[PDB]
Design an enzyme around this catalytic site. Sequence first.
Site, mmCIF file in Angstrom:
data_model
loop_
_atom_site.group_PDB
_atom_site.id
_atom_site.type_symbol
_atom_site.label_atom_id
_atom_site.label_comp_id
_atom_site.label_asym_id
_atom_site.label_seq_id
_atom_site.Cartn_x
_atom_site.Cartn_y
_atom_site.Cartn_z
ATOM 1 N N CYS A 163 0.823 -1.206 0.000
ATOM 2 C CA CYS A 163 0.000 0.000 0.000
ATOM 3 C C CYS A 163 0.865 1.267 0.000
ATOM 4 N N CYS A 215 -0.834 1.667 -3.741
ATOM 5 C CA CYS A 215 -1.844 2.694 -3.526
ATOM 6 C C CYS A 215 -1.272 4.102 -3.483
ATOM 7 N N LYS A 273 1.096 5.388 -6.420
ATOM 8 C CA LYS A 273 0.239 5.393 -7.616
ATOM 9 C C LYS A 273 -0.642 6.641 -7.628
ATOM 10 N N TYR A 276 -6.615 -3.662 -14.055
ATOM 11 C CA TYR A 276 -6.583 -2.280 -13.566
ATOM 12 C C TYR A 276 -5.197 -1.630 -13.484
ATOM 13 N N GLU A 293 -4.064 1.657 -15.353
ATOM 14 C CA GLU A 293 -3.561 2.781 -14.574
ATOM 15 C C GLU A 293 -2.223 3.253 -15.063
ATOM 16 N N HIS A 327 -27.481 19.869 -7.225
ATOM 17 C CA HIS A 327 -27.304 20.501 -8.521
ATOM 18 C C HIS A 327 -26.374 21.695 -8.440
ATOM 19 N N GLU A 386 -25.722 13.748 -9.093
ATOM 20 C CA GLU A 386 -27.175 13.789 -9.133
ATOM 21 C C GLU A 386 -27.752 12.875 -10.219
HETATM 22 C C1 LIG Z 1 -26.479 33.125 -7.865
HETATM 23 C C2 LIG Z 1 -27.317 31.920 -7.527
HETATM 24 C C3 LIG Z 1 -26.731 30.700 -7.448
HETATM 25 C C4 LIG Z 1 -27.456 29.542 -7.138
HETATM 26 N N1 LIG Z 1 -26.788 28.347 -7.147
HETATM 27 C C5 LIG Z 1 -27.508 27.275 -6.889
HETATM 28 C C6 LIG Z 1 -26.853 25.946 -6.971
HETATM 29 O O1 LIG Z 1 -25.681 25.820 -7.276
HETATM 30 N N2 LIG Z 1 -27.642 24.863 -6.656
HETATM 31 C C7 LIG Z 1 -29.012 24.967 -6.315
HETATM 32 O O2 LIG Z 1 -29.604 23.946 -6.067
HETATM 33 N N3 LIG Z 1 -29.634 26.182 -6.261
HETATM 34 C C8 LIG Z 1 -28.930 27.276 -6.534
HETATM 35 N N4 LIG Z 1 -29.545 28.488 -6.517
HETATM 36 C C9 LIG Z 1 -30.973 28.591 -6.193
HETATM 37 C C10 LIG Z 1 -31.826 28.064 -7.363
HETATM 38 O O3 LIG Z 1 -31.450 28.758 -8.566
HETATM 39 C C11 LIG Z 1 -33.268 28.456 -7.075
HETATM 40 O O4 LIG Z 1 -33.676 27.818 -5.862
HETATM 41 C C12 LIG Z 1 -34.225 27.978 -8.211
HETATM 42 O O5 LIG Z 1 -33.906 28.547 -9.496
HETATM 43 C C13 LIG Z 1 -35.660 28.369 -7.827
HETATM 44 O O6 LIG Z 1 -36.554 27.926 -8.920
HETATM 45 P P1 LIG Z 1 -38.020 28.493 -9.071
HETATM 46 O O7 LIG Z 1 -38.723 27.622 -10.112
HETATM 47 O O8 LIG Z 1 -38.637 28.666 -7.765
HETATM 48 O O9 LIG Z 1 -37.845 29.901 -9.659
HETATM 49 P P2 LIG Z 1 -37.070 30.668 -10.864
HETATM 50 O O10 LIG Z 1 -36.111 29.625 -11.388
HETATM 51 O O11 LIG Z 1 -36.686 31.981 -10.442
HETATM 52 O O12 LIG Z 1 -38.176 30.780 -11.889
HETATM 53 C C14 LIG Z 1 -39.166 31.944 -11.800
HETATM 54 C C15 LIG Z 1 -39.540 32.174 -13.264
HETATM 55 O O13 LIG Z 1 -40.883 32.799 -13.308
HETATM 56 C C16 LIG Z 1 -40.785 33.871 -14.292
HETATM 57 N N5 LIG Z 1 -41.854 34.763 -13.801
HETATM 58 C C17 LIG Z 1 -41.901 35.401 -12.566
HETATM 59 N N6 LIG Z 1 -43.043 36.049 -12.404
HETATM 60 C C18 LIG Z 1 -43.754 35.836 -13.545
HETATM 61 C C19 LIG Z 1 -45.067 36.303 -13.972
HETATM 62 N N7 LIG Z 1 -45.851 37.058 -13.241
HETATM 63 N N8 LIG Z 1 -45.420 35.914 -15.237
HETATM 64 C C20 LIG Z 1 -44.627 35.108 -16.012
HETATM 65 N N9 LIG Z 1 -43.435 34.634 -15.676
HETATM 66 C C21 LIG Z 1 -43.043 35.040 -14.459
HETATM 67 C C22 LIG Z 1 -39.375 34.374 -14.072
HETATM 68 O O14 LIG Z 1 -38.957 35.104 -15.215
HETATM 69 C C23 LIG Z 1 -38.591 33.061 -14.056
HETATM 70 O O15 LIG Z 1 -38.167 32.543 -15.277
HETATM 71 C C24 LIG Z 1 -28.844 29.638 -6.864
HETATM 72 C C25 LIG Z 1 -29.457 30.881 -6.946
HETATM 73 C C26 LIG Z 1 -28.723 32.003 -7.282
HETATM 74 C C27 LIG Z 1 -29.464 33.311 -7.336
HETATM 75 C C1 LIG Z 2 0.679 -0.805 -8.323
HETATM 76 C C2 LIG Z 2 -0.407 -1.159 -7.341
HETATM 77 C C3 LIG Z 2 -1.423 -0.286 -7.126
HETATM 78 C C4 LIG Z 2 -2.462 -0.557 -6.227
HETATM 79 N N1 LIG Z 2 -3.406 0.415 -6.029
HETATM 80 C C5 LIG Z 2 -4.347 0.142 -5.148
HETATM 81 C C6 LIG Z 2 -5.345 1.193 -4.831
HETATM 82 O O1 LIG Z 2 -5.314 2.294 -5.351
HETATM 83 N N2 LIG Z 2 -6.327 0.842 -3.932
HETATM 84 C C7 LIG Z 2 -6.387 -0.419 -3.294
HETATM 85 O O2 LIG Z 2 -7.290 -0.609 -2.518
HETATM 86 N N3 LIG Z 2 -5.460 -1.388 -3.557
HETATM 87 C C8 LIG Z 2 -4.492 -1.128 -4.430
HETATM 88 N N4 LIG Z 2 -3.543 -2.068 -4.676
HETATM 89 C C9 LIG Z 2 -3.589 -3.365 -3.989
HETATM 90 C C10 LIG Z 2 -3.186 -3.203 -2.512
HETATM 91 O O3 LIG Z 2 -1.904 -2.554 -2.445
HETATM 92 C C11 LIG Z 2 -2.988 -4.602 -1.947
HETATM 93 O O4 LIG Z 2 -4.232 -5.302 -2.027
HETATM 94 C C12 LIG Z 2 -2.563 -4.556 -0.446
HETATM 95 O O5 LIG Z 2 -1.320 -3.859 -0.231
HETATM 96 C C13 LIG Z 2 -2.429 -5.999 0.061
HETATM 97 O O6 LIG Z 2 -2.009 -5.940 1.478
HETATM 98 P P1 LIG Z 2 -1.393 -7.195 2.213
HETATM 99 O O7 LIG Z 2 -1.344 -6.853 3.702
HETATM 100 O O8 LIG Z 2 -2.067 -8.414 1.791
HETATM 101 O O9 LIG Z 2 0.048 -7.295 1.693
HETATM 102 P P2 LIG Z 2 1.365 -6.368 1.464
HETATM 103 O O10 LIG Z 2 0.852 -4.964 1.683
HETATM 104 O O11 LIG Z 2 2.070 -6.799 0.296
HETATM 105 O O12 LIG Z 2 2.176 -6.718 2.692
HETATM 106 C C14 LIG Z 2 3.064 -7.965 2.672
HETATM 107 C C15 LIG Z 2 4.206 -7.574 3.610
HETATM 108 O O13 LIG Z 2 4.790 -8.814 4.175
HETATM 109 C C16 LIG Z 2 6.235 -8.636 4.101
HETATM 110 N N5 LIG Z 2 6.661 -10.049 4.051
HETATM 111 C C17 LIG Z 2 6.354 -10.974 3.059
HETATM 112 N N6 LIG Z 2 6.810 -12.177 3.366
HETATM 113 C C18 LIG Z 2 7.425 -12.041 4.573
HETATM 114 C C19 LIG Z 2 8.134 -12.997 5.414
HETATM 115 N N7 LIG Z 2 8.284 -14.265 5.118
HETATM 116 N N8 LIG Z 2 8.674 -12.457 6.551
HETATM 117 C C20 LIG Z 2 8.513 -11.139 6.893
HETATM 118 N N9 LIG Z 2 7.865 -10.225 6.185
HETATM 119 C C21 LIG Z 2 7.367 -10.717 5.040
HETATM 120 C C22 LIG Z 2 6.393 -7.869 2.806
HETATM 121 O O14 LIG Z 2 7.663 -7.233 2.793
HETATM 122 C C23 LIG Z 2 5.337 -6.777 2.978
HETATM 123 O O15 LIG Z 2 5.704 -5.618 3.656
HETATM 124 C C24 LIG Z 2 -2.484 -1.794 -5.535
HETATM 125 C C25 LIG Z 2 -1.448 -2.694 -5.743
HETATM 126 C C26 LIG Z 2 -0.420 -2.390 -6.614
HETATM 127 C C27 LIG Z 2 0.656 -3.427 -6.789
HETATM 128 S S1 LIG Z 3 -30.484 24.622 -14.424
HETATM 129 C C1 LIG Z 3 -31.963 23.832 -15.112
HETATM 130 C C2 LIG Z 3 -32.574 22.735 -14.239
HETATM 131 N N1 LIG Z 3 -32.107 21.387 -14.589
HETATM 132 C C3 LIG Z 3 -31.763 20.537 -13.631
HETATM 133 O O1 LIG Z 3 -31.790 20.832 -12.443
HETATM 134 C C4 LIG Z 3 -31.432 19.087 -14.022
HETATM 135 C C5 LIG Z 3 -32.609 18.246 -13.449
HETATM 136 C C6 LIG Z 3 -32.415 16.729 -13.655
HETATM 137 N N2 LIG Z 3 -32.044 16.495 -15.034
HETATM 138 C C7 LIG Z 3 -33.708 15.949 -13.310
HETATM 139 O O2 LIG Z 3 -34.195 16.042 -12.085
HETATM 140 O O3 LIG Z 3 -34.232 15.270 -14.202
HETATM 141 C C8 LIG Z 3 -34.080 22.817 -14.387
HETATM 142 O O4 LIG Z 3 -34.687 23.874 -14.219
HETATM 143 N N3 LIG Z 3 -34.648 21.687 -14.800
HETATM 144 C C9 LIG Z 3 -36.068 21.618 -15.038
HETATM 145 C C10 LIG Z 3 -36.377 20.251 -15.615
HETATM 146 O O5 LIG Z 3 -37.548 20.000 -15.916
HETATM 147 O O6 LIG Z 3 -35.478 19.392 -15.746
#
Ligand SMILES: Cc1cc2nc3c(=O)[nH]c(=O)nc-3n(C[C@H](O)[C@H](O)[C@H](O)COP(=O)(O)OP(=O)(O)OC[C@H]3O[C@@H](n4cnc5c(N)ncnc54)[C@H](O)[C@@H]3O)c2cc1C
Ligand SMILES: Cc1cc2nc3c(=O)[nH]c(=O)nc-3n(C[C@H](O)[C@H](O)[C@H](O)COP(=O)(O)OP(=O)(O)OC[C@H]3O[C@@H](n4cnc5c(N)ncnc54)[C@H](O)[C@@H]3O)c2cc1C
Ligand SMILES: *SC[C@H](NC(=O)CC[C@H](N)C(=O)O)C(=O)NCC(=O)O
EC number: 1.8.1.7
Lengths: 461, 461
Positions: free
Chosen positions: B41, B46, B49, B180, B184, B450, B455
């Site tokens: 490891c 691990c 790598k 794998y 890798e 989202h 998701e």
């Molecule tokens: C900067 C920012 C970042 C965000 N980032 C995230 C995020 O990363 N993840 C997340 O989950 N949420 C995020 N949110 C929140 C998410 O965008 C809002 O919770 C979501 O869009 C609310 O959806 P809604 O349908 O309630 O309203 P809205 O999406 O606002 O839809 C209201 C709609 O009704 C229309 N409308 C309004 N009044 C009328 C009317 N009288 N007649 C006709 N049309 C009208 C508007 O034009 C608009 O298109 C973020 C919000 C902001 C502001």
């Molecule tokens: C290139 C590579 C990448 C890997 N990447 C991942 C990864 O990303 N994620 C993951 O989950 N697994 C990964 N693995 C596998 C993971 O490393 C092994 O499954 C894990 O190390 C096995 O542990 P172990 O205790 O069985 O043996 P080891 O960790 O090999 O320990 C054996 C130990 O016993 C000692 N030993 C042996 N014989 C004797 C003896 N007679 N007397 C005294 N000491 C002795 C050895 O020197 C050694 O230190 C990877 C393996 C390799 C080769």
């Molecule tokens: S930013 C536009 C929004 N899309 C999503 O949040 C993805 C939704 C997933 N694809 C899902 O739940 O299916 C949005 O306003 N979506 C409205 C819609 O009807 O998907």
Amino acid sequence: VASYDYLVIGGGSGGLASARRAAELGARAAVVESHKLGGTCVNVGCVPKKVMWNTAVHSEFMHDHADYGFPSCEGKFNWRVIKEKRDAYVSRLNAIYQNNLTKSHIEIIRGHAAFTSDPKPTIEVSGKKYTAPHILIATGGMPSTPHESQIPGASLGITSDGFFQLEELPGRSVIVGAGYIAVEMAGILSALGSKTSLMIRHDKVLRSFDSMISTNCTEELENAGVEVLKFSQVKEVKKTLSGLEVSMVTAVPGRLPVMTMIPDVDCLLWAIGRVPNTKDLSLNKLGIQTDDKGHIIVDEFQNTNVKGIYAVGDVCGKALLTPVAIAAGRKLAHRLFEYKEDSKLDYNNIPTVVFSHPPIGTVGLTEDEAIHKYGIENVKTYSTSFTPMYHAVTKRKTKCVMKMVCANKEEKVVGIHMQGLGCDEMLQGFAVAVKMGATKADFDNTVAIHPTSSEELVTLR
Amino acid sequence: VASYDYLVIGGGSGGLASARRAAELGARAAVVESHKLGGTCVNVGCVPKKVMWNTAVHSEFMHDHADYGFPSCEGKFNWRVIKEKRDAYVSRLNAIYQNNLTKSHIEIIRGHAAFTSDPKPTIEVSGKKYTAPHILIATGGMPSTPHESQIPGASLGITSDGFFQLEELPGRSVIVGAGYIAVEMAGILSALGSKTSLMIRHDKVLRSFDSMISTNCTEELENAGVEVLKFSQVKEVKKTLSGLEVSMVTAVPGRLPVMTMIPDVDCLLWAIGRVPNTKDLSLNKLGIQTDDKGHIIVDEFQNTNVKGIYAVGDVCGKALLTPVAIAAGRKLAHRLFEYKEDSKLDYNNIPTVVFSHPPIGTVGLTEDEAIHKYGIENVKTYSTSFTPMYHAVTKRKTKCVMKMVCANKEEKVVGIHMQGLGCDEMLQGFAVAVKMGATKADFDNTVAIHPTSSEELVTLR
Ligand SMILES: Cc1cc2nc3c(=O)[nH]c(=O)nc-3n(C[C@H](O)[C@H](O)[C@H](O)COP(=O)(O)OP(=O)(O)OC[C@H]3O[C@@H](n4cnc5c(N)ncnc54)[C@H](O)[C@@H]3O)c2cc1C
Ligand SMILES: Cc1cc2nc3c(=O)[nH]c(=O)nc-3n(C[C@H](O)[C@H](O)[C@H](O)COP(=O)(O)OP(=O)(O)OC[C@H]3O[C@@H](n4cnc5c(N)ncnc54)[C@H](O)[C@@H]3O)c2cc1C
Ligand SMILES: *SC[C@H](NC(=O)CC[C@H](N)C(=O)O)C(=O)NCC(=O)O
Ligand SMILES: *SC[C@H](NC(=O)CC[C@H](N)C(=O)O)C(=O)NCC(=O)O
Ligand SMILES: N[C@@H](CCC(=O)N[C@@H](CS)C(=O)NCC(=O)O)C(=O)O
Ligand SMILES: N[C@@H](CCC(=O)N[C@@H](CS)C(=O)NCC(=O)O)C(=O)O
């Protein structure tokens, strides 16, 4: 008066998802949209944000280039390049969503809808009237801005909407707010080279998240070069000869307030909140209930207080996420068109990812929330902090923090909180397990994947 | 004859994990190690790598730099830089593991162990004898190489062990194998700039994985510039004036065999298999059962056919992964030192990630395996193929493929297979859900995150 089975007001996530599902069920539906389809998700939210995030991510990785045996990469990010590609991608999505509606036979009514005085719930769009036994309001919300009356010059700042209109990278940027959008914007602007300040009213960002995340997140921002102005707020903004000048009051508790001027600001970005878009709907003509912020009030099945009028998504002001609006819109269609009366969205255990650097993933209860729900004596947490293997060879470092919140003797998993490389793609499946009611033994009994960050969650002790 | 409660032969994953857990339970344990702690490891698997993978990943991302608005990054990867940092990191781990043993009060016996003729199972290391009522053999395995008798000049090629000794990037490299490790290595060498060929005996790599993955994986390699020589095998290798010259026979079915010479080869890497390390243990002095490959035979509780002699890890030749050796070693300690008789590792639903480009994640049954297990009529699959949002703006493209295998009417999730950006960190939590026996409804009832690739798995239709 043209009649439909289902009339959807708003063509965003919620509205599109509900209309599409209802159409599959046989409903003859129409979507009213005054702007662009895809609404906030596509145009000014999720999508354009993610693209900008991928871009900032490139910036960071490029800092590690030399550590990894490559030659130093020298320079200047060109904002216009990615901006143009981002806009095009958005254009591609608008066309796809329009197509999605058409193939489903959903009619698209272009224009702004408003309810009428008519007895049976009826809307008007551009002089024509429309009706349906089921009407969904999914009008979303908008960015909140201060009143000039409270903060003179507030109108000189922009919102996340304006952010997506920027054509050049601002030299100096000040972000006001402590919520996810504020955090996201500051991190993108800062990674891309803007000299960025984040102005928060308390001492930490994301104060509603688990305290381990709010703390770590504030630290990671500082480490990434974002200046976090704690206990600060804007008193006034003014247009100087070259940029803006921000007057702020800093009021650290146990200290005297101090006023500071921030000069030569290119971009002042308000990220203080969102307001529901209900103001121009004429709700009161039907007596539809709203709260004092203008949010539409609904029950657990998305019903308003008026029969055959429903609301989903941001306009309801709860769990403001695209996938929540989608899921609630879908469940509602099955309830109305498939007669599944128990069809509704469970608002518990909704997962969230915050696209910070490194990203944040959260699902379920914070430590405090579980403590209030089950009692201190019945809550056990497990946590870890480590440096991802990626940074074993870099001079630049980021940490990974994970916390598991368990409840009762069984140690049911009621909350997972993390920040770190890979956390954005790691969250989904643990959210499945949390939803299914896994316990800590279920996690512990799953063989790990090595070497990954994800395995840390299954080997907590 | 010094006596202990537990004697562990081999200081790799399996041996270290078992000894550490037994020590917690009160056992007075000793670990015999002839080489370096951390075994495969840490030293040649691990860890080194993954570091090399992170490095190749930098190479790819750097191809997208210009698309993302940055200036083109110009050039030459310096192998020695990362090689030196990688070795140091390995040195840091050896010291940590040594410390881990010491703090647990585990004795470390340095040298090569072999069983003796003595009646009660006893080993000898450097003239001294050691005994215990419980002896764990965890000697791991090694890379397999061809016999000069079958492939003349085979000894001119190197194995994954030799790969970790390379000091310069080979100009021309030929990898032989379709498992794998072969995949890798080819992907790392190719990303870093070696002109790489992968020589496989059939038409696809990873032929034991789900057919969707073997197909996609072979395509992704070709797209990334790896030349895959299908239906080919090495007939002979020889040292020419400047590098090696590989004679191969290509035998496409429905065609005449054709012999080809591959000239100017810098690196010929054998990635054909692994052999257990049991040859020098003197197993036969106790009549311990092995198969014809030299693997130690065990039952479900890791018992050999001899009382008080157990085996875990690679030496047993099943599920050759670090986390499997660890988990089996741990379960065994609880069985022996905590008297938990039902304590054993379930070898079903073990997740695997293959660090290709993009990475592969798999857990559970392949489509064919479920078809054989439940019958064609009782197997339903769901799958998707899409271009991750990351590539919406790049000229270079990679795909993401996901497949869900369900069984019975309930649609129990019995297998998940994917390849794509983020898949390495995405797998863990879905593996928890699969282990818990989730159905498709459990997935479908989890709200999405989202925008992410993850998701896609929760919104399959
Ligand atoms: C900067 C920012 C970042 C965000 N980032 C995230 C995020 O990363 N993840 C997340 O989950 N949420 C995020 N949110 C929140 C998410 O965008 C809002 O919770 C979501 O869009 C609310 O959806 P809604 O349908 O309630 O309203 P809205 O999406 O606002 O839809 C209201 C709609 O009704 C229309 N409308 C309004 N009044 C009328 C009317 N009288 N007649 C006709 N049309 C009208 C508007 O034009 C608009 O298109 C973020 C919000 C902001 C502001
Ligand atoms: C290139 C590579 C990448 C890997 N990447 C991942 C990864 O990303 N994620 C993951 O989950 N697994 C990964 N693995 C596998 C993971 O490393 C092994 O499954 C894990 O190390 C096995 O542990 P172990 O205790 O069985 O043996 P080891 O960790 O090999 O320990 C054996 C130990 O016993 C000692 N030993 C042996 N014989 C004797 C003896 N007679 N007397 C005294 N000491 C002795 C050895 O020197 C050694 O230190 C990877 C393996 C390799 C080769
Ligand atoms: S930013 C536009 C929004 N899309 C999503 O949040 C993805 C939704 C997933 N694809 C899902 O739940 O299916 C949005 O306003 N979506 C409205 C819609 O009807 O998907
Ligand atoms: S590459 C060295 C191996 N470490 C790990 O696989 C990490 C294991 C987890 N930290 C865990 O399950 O606790 C290894 O050989 N580890 C042996 C050990 O005892 O941790
Ligand atoms: N699994 C995480 C953390 C790295 C990790 O697994 N590190 C092990 C070495 S393989 C470690 O540092 N072990 C030292 C210890 O026991 O604390 C990752 O891959 O980033
Ligand atoms: N969720 C994946 C796929 C991207 C995605 O969600 N794409 C949506 C736009 S937000 C799409 O292309 N929709 C078009 C369609 O309906 O096929 C990711 O983020 O990479």
